[PDB]
Symmetry: D2
Subunit: 257 residues, 4 copies
């Protein structure tokens, strides 16, 4: 009951370049006729985002600088999206960070600084984004964050980022419980591994890809467009009965041991 | 871009739907969504006497032809000859929606420790094994791959008051879904479950525990409301189509978030 | 708290010196519990008796129970009650599946095979719990053995995997049912161990080889380690724990 | 024959460090009681200067030949590092650690979870989760033959529980922390596990919103139809800290009357 997203409006957070999971999301939602608003942190992502948008069908470029480490910029940014475009239907959250040092060494060796930075950027950011986005969804809508199986199970070399994704998945459940009575669904997609910018020189990544290929039920890896397709289902009314959920888009790998 | 692109378009696709009893059946919610989305639909039913009502029910869909097959999933021969006949009459298919379970009332009403052997094995057979043999037979009609979806309940994952023998059968079903996904994945067949919140169907009539948990969902669930058959139907169309192309071995909860809280 | 003298336990499913249940018995015997054993078939009893000569039981309490039969499970526990009195718990270490179903494709599983594995490996716990409850009027503890393949699709575990998923739910529903009777019901989820029922799985050494390489503890587990956790779960030490599944698997359950 | 009673758990010759006793109602004092009854040499850590003397009062309730107390605020690397280094010098090698430390700002707990402060979110994560990571790294220096580390969690780390809010996100992080430390430290023969306790009326639970209601719910709905206490957490701790749980690592044992298993 509802196959098109015309008249829908979504914010996409965390496109960095053509290989971003959030750009797969953007491409999909754009082909379904949604208006899209984009948020970036640093500059090279702006001059990039302007270039990538040329591939989309969007009749105007709504681009806002939000570093989610600043409550101010989150609060001001969403307030401004509100003034510029009005109410929205949902947010796609494609944002995380861990220090390379921490991931390279033993988990027991993780710095206090790296642990809290990963938490702040990869989990708390969803909390304050939801709180501010809600102000633009007076009738409800849908919030989707991106996670990885390493938040549910200890995965070799994922280390501090795993604890941050475990924190994130709890965040989704608690937000879902908090925001449900306001008609706002909150859900995660647990993407299988995908070769993005931030996957570059991560140890454990290439071998994890090969392992998926050999052992996952579908015997192949997933891509950004496949995440995008599940994101469209979660952000639309097709999943209207569905909240606090974590959909694995990972070729079945979560289901096997 | 001159046109609205569709998230799901099932024109020229064919799906087998098993387990429609009447208008309030979860599977009829599935049927209404898939029909509206353009699918050709094939229906199966347990007993000869149910055909007439089923066919009369069917007419309010937009199916330019009625495809109805008698299949009691207790009988290997009826499952095998049934899907064989479907193949001969309509061709290859894209998927199967499984909405079939049974547990004895006497077993359900007793204490779980008092469950009868006979009723335990009957619940396993109809509610779980039936997915295995339907998947084997339906695979023959899916030479390029497809999608199979079964219907389960949260009581397969946790002890829910009164759900008793049916909870054990649903746990067996959920694991059936995972092993089938692993077995059939290399053939491009995805196998998934929808864990539906409680819905007022024919089968829910007179089942102890049902109303208690329904009122609990309304009070405590994140959405503070119960789901309907059409919301199961919308999730079924996601799983059964290419919108869910990387997803297999999964159990999507359509239950207002109740699964997520304690 | 620390010694099980003056406790009594029924142990179901010792086959031979390599059975997980014999790990359990050695352990319980060492802690001074009185033990009562069940076995499936009569031609088996004499060689069970010789095995139990290695324990410190003064008296061989041995009862023949094939858990496919209501009547034998009923009369078996009746006899135990009349012969030894009340008990403090049961260790359930029984399972079966036809070997053919485990290394054909899962979608090819036969109906007869599927249900026989459900009957023996899962329903048996329910009826045993029901009859054992009669010997436990101030409460007690029942423990079943499971494997990770009841939680995730483990390659080739197939119909046993579905049976073990059935068993783990059976454990939770029993815990809820019998909790107000002060009876706790829990599972141990053992890592793979080289028992007699493991011979005949093709590639079993390669499976032990994955645990050694990848599990947090980088080693496989043994029958006596299962028994140590069994003693915890069968004693008052775990007095607040019911409906639980403890993995005794060198931490494999926790990694991906 | 056997001429003697085998012992499930004998802790004589074992030494354990216990972090997070505030007072008599602490979950960690219930742990202390059970380890001391079993013969363990215990070493205690505490947060403030001023709480020291009153902790020493508690101790004489125990069979300890001498008071080993070390001031350690887990927010400060130096104090954990120095604290363990000193324990090693004063006492020598150890057999495990029991971690019973958590904090969440009351103001955060009392708002809607969506209103949680950044400062409070990170403070919860630091004390309630990161602290396990650094304790493990330091304790391991005193565990060359290996040993056992246990942390204390709650079901609201696994499911959204009304009013647990930011502490629930912190327990989620802790439960992951536990799995990652299990994987990292397993080759060193160090096991790492959690106990997920049912609600217990401790000093920290006082003033906490949602607590009393859940206590009643447990008595009514849990399989054992009763609440657990601190000594019951202690006995499961003694299992996890000892060789009785050899082979068990990365696990979360629910000591909660079966409530986790129902819906
Ligand atoms: N790649 C994979 O295999 C998997 C990734 N994920 C998750 O998917 C999401 C997207 O990552 P991915 O596409 O891999 O790679 P990208 O590196 O393309 O995207 C990550 C984005 O996070 C942004 N970001 C980082 N810190 C901040 C901050 N302080 N404020 C605002 N934005 C910030 C980056 O912005 P900037 O322009 O500042 O770099 C970038 O746009 C993440 O949550 C990731 O953990 C989940 C499963 C697997
Ligand atoms: N209602 C609810 O609250 C929930 C239901 N579910 C599940 O959804 C599915 C559909 O249930 P629901 O719509 O409630 O009930 P319905 O009674 O509407 O439909 C159940 C169907 O199963 C059929 N069936 C039973 N035994 C057999 C058999 N041997 N061979 C073939 N078909 C058989 C019934 O046939 P007949 O009428 O001929 O006997 C009927 O068509 C079931 O798996 C159920 O467990 C899951 C979660 C919650
Ligand atoms: N070995 C392993 O790797 C693992 C085993 N498990 C589980 O541990 C338990 C013990 O297995 P294990 O020790 O390996 O193997 P064993 O073969 O030693 O023991 C299994 C026992 O079950 C008995 N049994 C089978 N059918 C019946 C029946 N109808 N009535 C009564 N008893 C019956 C067998 O009887 P008989 O002697 O007549 O054959 C045998 O004594 C099982 O539940 C198993 O699935 C769990 C994790 C891994
Ligand atoms: N009570 C319950 O219902 C449940 C509690 N838990 C968990 O059990 C554990 C113990 O809780 P509980 O016994 O209730 O309450 P307590 O209040 O007795 O214990 C909490 C302890 O943590 C110490 N602590 C806090 N911050 C620091 C810090 N910066 N450095 C060092 N120590 C610090 C406190 O010190 P101080 O006195 O200096 O403030 C106090 O001793 C916690 O992890 C809690 O989350 C789990 C499930 C349920
Ligand atoms: C944003 C970011 C940063 N800053 C550092 C490391 C990783 C990531 C994002 N990312 C990237 C890759 C990924 O792959 C999961 C598969 C792996 C397993 C172990 C290590 S990688 C998951 C994932 O979360
Ligand atoms: C087909 C069938 C039969 N023969 C017997 C009982 C139940 C069902 C179908 N059904 C119906 C309702 C349902 O409700 C879930 C909520 C409940 C909780 C406890 C009891 S019912 C789940 C569910 O599976
Ligand atoms: C009693 C029985 C029968 N009749 C048939 C198969 C297996 C068993 C017992 N067993 C034996 C081995 C085992 O190993 C787990 C690891 C495996 C993975 C895939 C196949 S085995 C688990 C396990 O359950
Ligand atoms: C140390 C601390 C601080 N500083 C603040 C809040 C909670 C706690 C410890 N605590 C205390 C009680 C508790 O009870 C679990 C039951 C609950 C459910 C909802 C609210 S309480 C869990 C729990 O973790
Ligand atoms: Cl009939």
């Amino acid at each position: 009951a509802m196959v098109n997203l015309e008249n829908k409006t979504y914010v996409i957070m965390g496109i960095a370049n053509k290989r971003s999971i959030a750009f797969g999301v953007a491409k999909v939602l754009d082909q379904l006729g949604a208006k899209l608003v984009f948020t970036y942190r640093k500059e090279r992502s702006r001059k990039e985002l302007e270039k990538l948008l040329e591939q989309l069908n969007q009749p105007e470029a709504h681009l806002y600088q939000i570093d989610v480490q600043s409550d101010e910029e989150v609060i001001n940014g969403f307030e401004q999206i509100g003034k510029d475009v009005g109410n929205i239907d949902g947010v796609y959250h494609s944002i995380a960070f861990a220090n390379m040092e921490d991931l390279r060494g033993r988990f027991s060796e993780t710095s206090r600084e790296g642990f809290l930075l990963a938490q702040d950027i990869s989990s708390y950011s969803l909390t304050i984004v939801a709180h501010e986005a809600k102000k633009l969804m007076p009738e409800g809508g849908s919030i989707v964050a991106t996670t990885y199986l390493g938040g549910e199970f200890a995965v070799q070399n994922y280390n501090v980022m795993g604890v941050a994704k475990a924190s994130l998945e709890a965040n989704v459940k608690y937000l879902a419980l908090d925001l449900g009575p306001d008609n706002i669904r909150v859900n995660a997609i647990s993407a299988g591994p995908i070769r993005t910018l931030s996957a570059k020189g991560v140890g454990g990544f290439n071998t994890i890809l090969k392992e998926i290929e050999e052992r996952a039920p579908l015997k192949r890896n997933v891509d950004q467009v496949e995440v995008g397709k599940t994101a469209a289902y979660l952000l639309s009314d097709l999943s209207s009965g569905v909240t606090g959920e974590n959909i694995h888009v990972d070729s079945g790998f979560h289901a096997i041991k």
